[PDB]
Symmetry: C6
Subunit: 90 residues, 6 copies
């Protein structure tokens, strides 16, 4: 039920973030959010330990990306149920 997010400047980087994330750990990819300014976020759910593993992987592997830039990242272990239908984290 944890949520993990990686926000990049650039689309290719966000794809590699996503790929690496789902490969590293037992997490599933649920979201891809654009907010303009080149800022795109990919979002996964899973056990916190796994989501935690997945996010670490994504951040590491983005430096493999020519032009890759990570803007922010975050994990929430136990997100409130109210978030599930306001925010595209589902």
């Amino acid at each position: 039920i944890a949520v993990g997010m990686i926000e990049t400047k650039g689309f290719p980087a966000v794809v590699e973030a996503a790929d690496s994330m789902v490969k590293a750990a037992r997490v599933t990819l649920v979201g891809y959010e654009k907010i303009g300014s080149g800022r795109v976020t990919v979002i996964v759910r899973g056990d916190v330990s796994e989501v935690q593993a997945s996010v670490t992987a994504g951040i590491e592997n983005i430096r493999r990306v020519n032009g890759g830039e990570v803007l922010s990242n975050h994990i929430i272990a136990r997100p409130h149920e109210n978030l599930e239908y306001v925010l595209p984290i589902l």
Copy 2:
């Protein structure tokens, strides 16, 4: 009928803001608004006291966020009814 808002630059931050807000106090998260340029606002309604507690929590918990940035925040204790049907400050 109070309204609280936190505007961040970055999406993960806005999610923490939201999570923190609804956890800290008895308030309902009613929305999330993009206006471009990375700027996204998370919005809650509740008793002023609870909204004030939600906003304070969200602001202080965003500093935990790697790459998190808070651009603005605001509370209106008693917003005018006119605002509800022009501005996205009732449930989306």
Copy 3:
């Protein structure tokens, strides 16, 4: 029939602009316009003297906003009827 507009960088500020506007004077709020770049405008109609009162209030009260920034503001006392259905001022 006057039109008053306040444009801010930031959404919360635009809400406070709106709130203050409708509270100060006999004006009604009709519009909220986004043009990107963080630029959002709120728009009211009413008697010029009131719209005038309302805009003054909104500009004053935005400094109460943590992160508040006013970009522009304007009043038109007697807007042409052609504007009403091209521009979201209605």
Copy 4:
């Protein structure tokens, strides 16, 4: 069949532009176009002489606008028909 355009950075300015244009001369306001980055263009059609009078008025009246800024302006006296169905320069 002339076309006149004024592009501003800021929405209130574009409204003044439009107001000024249709007041100064015998022209019709046919649209308003956003392309991002605050950039919004107001567009009119009319006789070249009237369009030229509209645009001049709009530009000079925007300096009245607090925070107003004009980014570009242009007139085409006799625009090619091809433009009408690719570019938003007939009534929106």
Copy 5:
């Protein structure tokens, strides 16, 4: 079957680009693409020699535009058929 494109910062300039393009040569205007950041592209098709003529005209005439700014331009003489329905070049 050639494709010619002119990208400006600003809308009025893109209109003058378009106008000049279709006037200079035997080319037809097919596209107007926005990608944000003020960046708008107009797109024509025609014989390469004509498209070539049309693009030269558009670039020259944009300096007539108060506030005119050309960001990029390009011609492809013989674009792959796969481009026609992925990209708004048709």
Copy 6:
């Protein structure tokens, strides 16, 4: 099942990228993605060898483009299935 992407600042560049990619090798152009700020990505799928040949060609041919700029590029040889239904990397 490899994926190749080229992200440009500017639309004409992205068209050259695409043209170059599908011409250089046996790959299919599956999309074009805007994320704002001028940033547009062109995306192909194919055998890794062909995708690698497509991307190299596109990058080197964009330097021909007047005003062309490449912001990022990337290839994933064996992308995870999960990506296909969250990210726009199957045909648009």
